[PDB]
Amino acid sequence: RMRGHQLLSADVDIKELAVETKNFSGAELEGLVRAAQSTAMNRHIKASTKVEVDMEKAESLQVTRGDFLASLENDIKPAFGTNQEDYASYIMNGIIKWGDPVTRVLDDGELLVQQTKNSDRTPLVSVLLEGPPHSGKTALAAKIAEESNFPFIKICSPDKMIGFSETAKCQAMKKIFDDAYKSQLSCVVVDDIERLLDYVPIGPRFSNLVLQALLVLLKKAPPQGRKLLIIGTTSRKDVLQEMEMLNAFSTTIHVPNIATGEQLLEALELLGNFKDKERTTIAQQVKGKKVWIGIKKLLMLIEMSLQMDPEYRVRKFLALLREEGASP
Amino acid sequence: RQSIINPDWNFEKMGIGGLDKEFSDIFRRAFASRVFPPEIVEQMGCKHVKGILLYGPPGCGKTLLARQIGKMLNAREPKVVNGPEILNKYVGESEANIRKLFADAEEEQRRLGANSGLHIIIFDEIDAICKQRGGVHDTVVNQLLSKIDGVEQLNNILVIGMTNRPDLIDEALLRPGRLEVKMEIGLPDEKGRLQILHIHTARMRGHQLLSADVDIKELAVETKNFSGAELEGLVRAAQSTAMNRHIKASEKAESLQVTRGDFLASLENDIKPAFGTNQEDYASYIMNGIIKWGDPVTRVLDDGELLVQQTKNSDRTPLVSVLLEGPPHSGKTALAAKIAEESNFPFIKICSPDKMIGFSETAKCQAMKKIFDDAYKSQLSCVVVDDIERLLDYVPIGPRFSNLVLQALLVLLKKAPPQGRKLLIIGTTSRKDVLQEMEMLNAFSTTIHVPNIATGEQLLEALELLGNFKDKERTTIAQQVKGKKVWIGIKKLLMLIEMSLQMDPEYRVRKFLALLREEGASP
Amino acid sequence: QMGCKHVKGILLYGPPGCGKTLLARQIGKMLNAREPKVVNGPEILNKYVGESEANIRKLFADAEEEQRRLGANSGLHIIIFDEIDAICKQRGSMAGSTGVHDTVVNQLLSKIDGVEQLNNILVIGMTNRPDLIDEALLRPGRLEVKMEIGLPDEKGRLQILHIHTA
Amino acid sequence: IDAICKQRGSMAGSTGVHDTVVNQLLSKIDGVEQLNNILVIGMTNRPDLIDEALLRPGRLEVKMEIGLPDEKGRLQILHIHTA
Amino acid sequence: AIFASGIIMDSSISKQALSEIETRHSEIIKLENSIRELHD
Ligand SMILES: Nc1ncnc2c1ncn2[C@@H]1O[C@H](COP(=O)(O)OP(=O)(O)OP(=O)(O)O)[C@@H](O)[C@H]1O
Ligand SMILES: Nc1ncnc2c1ncn2[C@@H]1O[C@H](COP(=O)(O)OP(=O)(O)OP(=O)(O)O)[C@@H](O)[C@H]1O
Ligand SMILES: Nc1ncnc2c1ncn2[C@@H]1O[C@H](COP(=O)(O)OP(=O)(O)OP(=O)(O)O)[C@@H](O)[C@H]1O
Ligand SMILES: Nc1ncnc2c1ncn2[C@@H]1O[C@H](COP(=O)(O)OP(=O)(O)O)[C@@H](O)[C@H]1O
């Protein structure tokens, strides 16, 4: 109807918008179109004094793809799709290549993602990521999920379940996993498993109902004709193995820490904080030793050391690194 | 046809400031298609928006905006639903009341069609009726959903909703074709404060009642994290103070004027912001000042501001933490309070276990969550936690404690605030080892140590600063204390001094020495 | 000429039986106000649905009708509550964990300051536990003045004996 | 017949009408006057909700339970439905 | 779901609105006859 009266520009491609919008319900397309039309119309109205309509440019009113892009980015937010705010809040400081393990982990993730798309005998595969604390294992999972390119991607973390009872957590997990069954492809990421059970070394204590609900939900195949991928993160592996929970998982991936002077120097150079003169001394000090520190801890130490005086940063940074040490 | 917007309406008269972007977006999305020439709109064949939702903290200008929007349009007088006034007891009354609201709109639409006038419906405290589904609240939501968008179509209605808890609102009522334009009204930054003061001090200036020594810029800069309602309260209190002073001083009119002194007094005594700094807490927790009895106090004070400046200036670390620990009766809470006060932040709060006497776990968790949520709606904050072991209810027997509170505290110590904001959490404790066993020391970014008095010289310096004993008595103690070391806290020392001071004028020293010897322990 | 609105309510918190109702009656009798409407907190509550709200709303009809009839030339009205804290408590935030008396608080908040403005009313509250009151009911728009009445000192006892023995 | 007949003294609404209705039905079906030309047939889906005093011999004796057909039942239903 | 339906008891028929209404009109017949005779 809009194109009937030559109201649509000649630089708007419908197929591009159709491909861009993934898993958009019917009403959201109408909402997007209405928002774009309203934004286009608003360009000829000024609201600061007695309302006056510029009736001279009304003959050159046209809708440009820029309006559609702006309305999509700002106004319309889907519900069964994906949003870029989660990846902007979980990949805050980005990802950098400080060695070989990152590439290997990314390759393994990509290989796992290809199987759950071109396979008919295993329509449900799960993997577990584990490592020492402060090793940055959630960012890698988020990056893998983003690079999967599946239509429906969701992240289930305990950050939204503060104060909830075990029953509430179980009924949130059930709701999420049920909503995940209404698509031809889906990825679900479980974050900090050892904090979804309320584990505490003393006793030890934990929630049995949540553990059972999680053990029963890892072996339920979706409706015929659909696929699913489950990723999970955890920093205490032995504890999970003790409760006989590693059987449900199909494989495992190990994320190591920095363990050489060259890797630390490369990471420092990539970050771009210290000058070359200081780099000379820091290399001369580190090369003849070994280190054991995570990336997050290194960033925090660098930030804390940067607050000193111009001619005291290096000494305090070295003192902090030695105090923390390695403790293999 | 007469235009929808009154010919005599103008923004300057609306009397609203600090909400330019929100009003511009509302006008662009809602009323944009109701002002263009109808002949053009007819070709596009597009339906108008049917709802608007506004949410935010108490006292920021929601109802005012709805009233102005209602009185802006040339439509007929709007309806009003003051809270949940549609409930009733007989089986089949709430639905009838709900249906009775849309009768006139449907009748007018049937009678006229595409030339009907506009209707307005204003809902107040919507979250008290429209709650998520799943026989007291599930047969009004269905009626409302069916009426808003049913088998028959309507194009001459507009629903405005208001609430303080947007999360509890149903989900099926917030989709396109329904109340979809959602806006948030938040504490105003500086320009908003200046605009609000100018709006609220306009009539008085026209009649030359404002003194010449009052500058609105200083008032705007001084008041931080106030909300419009608070600024209005401040002005009214100043005016009332001036009027009361004039009347009580002594026909005597024509000389009344508002001066800077009245504004200062009203701000200092009358107005207490909800998201601002309160000096009563600092007065209550620091009851004997701070005395520099040795290096450790200076070291701690020179370490605290470094962390404060790190959290204030950096950009890759929007969250910082620290833990103060030491032997009992060492004065940790006072040092933490002083460090917080010296930060000069615009939002400081202290959470202590003495306001939760007899509270269950599911109340302490709620209190902590509410405090953190409040701290999350300001561009800077500082939350202090003291007596962690009392929050956890730890007892050596067992051991026994609350797991839910521990998990909530652990989760709340790593969740960063929204993008662009910063936070700083300080915590104290007197039992480090137990915290380490529970695997809690791995979440704090740094730790600090406050030492006890370990040398006679420090004790003599503290006694001098206190100013209790004279030179002869001072030397009397020095002769016996300088020959060895001591181990006593500041609070215990004050208690011992107070206990000793109640003896006879000549026997104070002997009892003080006896008490010190009895209390003395192995370092 | 200044154009300043009047205060809309006050709150008095203190030990029971120290002279709070008497002061409330005298303050009304001093401003040439009409008969004050006294209401007891715990008596408002009811078990049927939609009965507490009706009782809360029944106390404002006269003010609204007088304001409508006489416009801005109406007199003054006063409403006094008793154990107000027993009908106003902090509202829950988590979904599915709300209280049983939130509708009453919502209705009171809507009536005290809603879309339509009333300028011929005044509210006095008296309580003993001022720390259990909601937060939205203490902002400068409502109940913006709080006072404490304590146990009397020697001068107070002497004056009380004088008054009661004169 | 289960909508209007139920165990008396159980409703928590306006039971003042249901008890009277059930009592009137009981009195009329078999009371002081003897009838010999009346036949009552009743269907339902909740056998255990009907009032016990109404199922005593003399008022409602014949009770039948209809279940799922067996193999010969299916081989007969299909034949009936395709003549 | 605390609520309850209600039952009604009509009164639009009063057995005491038939005595006075009938007795009242029974006395105007003589007056009408007398006035008719007077007019004739
Ligand atoms: N190559 C990298 N690998 C991992 N993290 C990286 C890398 N480059 C940058 N980062 C940053 O490291 C930060 C570490 O945060 P994250 O929550 O993933 O840590 P974690 O050690 O897995 O968690 P936890 O503290 O709960 O044990 C991420 O925010 C990411 O921004
Ligand atoms: N930007 C502003 N300009 C002028 N006045 C303002 C502004 N914001 C708030 N106010 C003041 O707000 C008061 C009305 O408050 P309002 O009705 O918006 O409260 P609210 O947010 O609905 O409160 P609550 O939800 O707690 O009931 C008026 O006195 C008005 O002066
Ligand atoms: N320089 C100082 N440092 C610490 N406290 C001081 C100092 N000078 C005086 N004080 C007094 O020390 C008192 C110690 O009180 P506080 O509650 O902080 O003690 P604490 O030892 O941290 O607590 P707890 O008894 O719970 O272990 C404070 O009331 C303050 O009056
Ligand atoms: N300041 C006072 N002056 C005179 N009488 C007082 C005073 N304070 C209390 N009383 C007396 O105390 C009694 C109870 O007062 P009342 O206000 O009814 O108490 P409550 O606050 O419990 O309602 C009355 O007889 C009143 O005269």
Author numbering:
A (entry chain C): 413 to 740
B (entry chain B): 205 to 338, 345 to 460, 468 to 740
C (entry chain A): 247 to 412
D (entry chain D): 330 to 412
E (entry chain G): 175 to 214
Please give sentences taken from the publication describing this entry.
The membrane-anchored SNARE (soluble N-ethylmaleimide-sensitive factor acceptor protein receptor) proteins provide the energy to drive membrane fusion in various cellular contexts, such as intracellular trafficking and exocytosis. Supercomplexes of NSF, α-SNAP, and either a syntaxin tetramer or one of two binary complexes of syntaxin—SNAP-25 reveal atomic details of SNARE processing and show how sequential ATP hydrolysis drives disassembly. NSF comprises three structured domains connected by flexible linkers—the adapter N-domain followed by the D1 and D2 AAA+ domains. Six NSF protomers come together to form the active form of the enzyme, a homo-hexamer.
To gain insight into the structural nature of binary complex formation and disassembly by NSF, we prepared a complex of NSF, ɑ-SNAP, and the binary t-SNARE complex (21bin20S) composed of full-length soluble SNAP-25 and soluble syntaxin-1a (1–267) in the absence of divalent cation (i.e., non-hydrolyzing conditions) and performed single-particle cryo-EM. First, models of the NSF D1 and D2 domains with substrate bound in the D1 pore were built into two high-resolution (2.88 Å, 2.92 Å) classes from a single dataset, differing only in the state of F protomer engagement with substrate. Next, the dataset from which they were derived was combined with two additional datasets to enable the 3D reconstruction of weakly populated states with ordered density for the ɑ-SNAP—SNARE spire. Classes with evidence of NSF D1 domains engaging ordered ɑ-SNAP—SNARE sub-complexes were carried forward; eight 21bin20S models were built into reconstructions ranging from 3.39–4.01 Å in resolution, differing mainly in the orientation of N domains and a sub-complex of three ɑ-SNAP molecules and four SNARE motifs relative to the D1 ATPase ring. All classes revealed substrate-bound NSF without Mg2+ needed for ATP hydrolysis and disassembly, and share the same overall architecture, with a spire composed of NSF N-domains and the ɑ-SNAP—SNARE subcomplex on top, the NSF D1 ring in the middle tier, and the NSF D2 ring forming the bottom tier. As such, the stoichiometry of the syntaxin—SNAP-25 complex observed is 2:1, the dominant species in solution. Three ɑ-SNAP molecules bind the 2:1 binary SNARE complex; a flexible linker between SNAP-25 SN1 and SN2 blocks access by a fourth. Of the eight 21bin20S classes with the 2:1 binary SNARE complex from the dataset collected under non-hydrolyzing conditions, six engage syntaxin and two engage SNAP-25 within the pore of the D1 ring. Docking the 2:1 binary complex structure back into the seven individual 21bin20S reconstructions reveals an apparent preference for syntaxin, with six of eight reconstructions featuring the N-terminus of syntaxin H3 bound within the pore of the D1 ring. Taken together, we observe that the NSF D1 ring can bind to at least two different SNAREs, syntaxin, and SNAP-25, in various configurations.
